[PDB]
Structures are given as structure tokens and as C-alpha cells.
Amino acid sequence: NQIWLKVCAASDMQPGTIRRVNRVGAAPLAVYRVGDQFYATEDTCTHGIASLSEGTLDGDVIECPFHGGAFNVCTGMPASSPCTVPLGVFEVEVKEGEVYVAGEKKLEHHHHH
Ligand code: FES
Numbered sequence: 290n291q292i293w294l295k296v297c298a299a300s301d302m303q304p305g306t307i308r309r310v311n312r313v314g315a316a317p318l319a320v321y322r323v324g325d326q327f328y329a330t331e332d333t334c335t336h337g338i339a340s341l342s343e344g345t346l347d348g349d350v351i352e353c354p355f356h357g358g359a360f361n362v363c364t365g366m367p368a369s370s371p372c373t374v375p376l377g378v379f380e381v382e383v384k385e386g387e388v389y390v391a392g393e394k395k396l397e398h399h400h401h402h
């Protein structure tokens with residue numbers, strides 16, 4: 290909502306490509322161009338800690354490079370074994386021809402007694 294991370298020009302991403310987005314002190318994101326639409330998840334495969342931005346898109350499915358598990362990039366839901374834990378999904382907006390991913394940070398929670 291408030292936090293947006295500038296990735297690159299929309300024209301800098303060919304369809305079927307992934308860009309990794311690093312966040313100082315937080316988990317990296319993967320931004321995917323599927324044809325003419327943009328999606329984002331956590332970059333880190335929930336199964337065995339691989340970088341999904343080093344994988345292969347097959348339409349709207351990201352194939353993990355380590356064990357060939359896979360996720361739907363739109364839903365974050367597992368699409369191939371051995372993946373069982375869904376990815377966090379992040380909103381992506383193109384603003385003035387530039388790709389931004391939501392920082393979906395400001396997750397804030399106090400000590401309960
Ligand atoms: S690390 Fe991704 S499928 Fe195992």
C-alpha cells in the first residue's frame with residue numbers, strides 16, 4: 290500500500306523473464322513478466338532455499354532450479370512436487386512505464402503478556 294520498490298522499466302523485461310529484487314534486511318522477491326502481465330512472489334523456494342529468479346517460467350508457473358518443484362506466480366500456490374508450502378504474493382504496478390513491487394512490509398506486532 291505505502292511501500293513500493295522500483296524494479297526496472299517494463300520494456301527491460303522480455304515476456305517469460307524474472308528479476309530478483311533485494312530488500313535491505315528482508316527476504317528477496319522475484320518479479321515475473323508472463324506475456325504482458327507482471328506478478329511477484331518471495332524469491333526463496335519454500336522447499337529447499339533455491340532462488341526462483343534462477344528458474345524457468347512455463348506460462349504462469351515458475352519451475353525451481355534446485356529440485357524442479359514449481360509454483361503458480363499469480364497465486365503463489367504449489368504447482369509441482371516437492372513444493373507444499375505456498376509463496377507470499379506481492380502486488381506489482383507499472384507506473385509511468387516502470388515496474389514497482391509492493392514492499393508488503395510494515396508488518397508490525399507487539400510483545401503479548
Ligand atoms: S529448493 Fe525448490 S523444489 Fe526444492
Ligand code: NA
Pocket residue numbers: 347352
Ligand atoms: Na516445463
